Amino acid sequence: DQQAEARSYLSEEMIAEFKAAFDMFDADGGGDISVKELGTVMRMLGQTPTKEELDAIIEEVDEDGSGTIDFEEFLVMMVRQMKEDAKGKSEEELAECFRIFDRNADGYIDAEELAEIFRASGEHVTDEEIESLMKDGDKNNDGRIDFDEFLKMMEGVQ
């Protein structure tokens, strides 16, 4: 149900990598893994919950208590954790970056405005790069990105 959201919130290459690790600890080959393997799988993909937090998670996902979790369950949870653990800029400071980024002040940052950004940087951002940044950032697909969408994209970024 509230899964597709979690799916949406994650990029294509992320869900592609998450699987990889998941499948890795899936001998049963039933798109299933033991809750005693969660902590370690979550470690492979950046997350570092404390054993007490991993216990909380196990209680949430596996409520009925079978000792395993599927991939859609993995997703939904991984995303919540990623969010919880977040440690990026606040709303105030992130909104100021936004207005720096919105040249015409239409309430969006568009493809063109995007590449206008890395120009100030000494880096070389490929056309696709710009397109992928907007791709994951674009959630209603309006072709651009508004503040609220800019928040998610900036979630816990340093």
Partner: protein, 31 residues
Amino acid sequence: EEKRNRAITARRQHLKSVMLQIAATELEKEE
């Protein structure tokens, strides 16, 4: 095959970090 995407997500996460700097930098020059 999955090494690439690992890189893809990395590069992306990095560019977002850059964005914040560019922004920050520009926000100081506003003085």
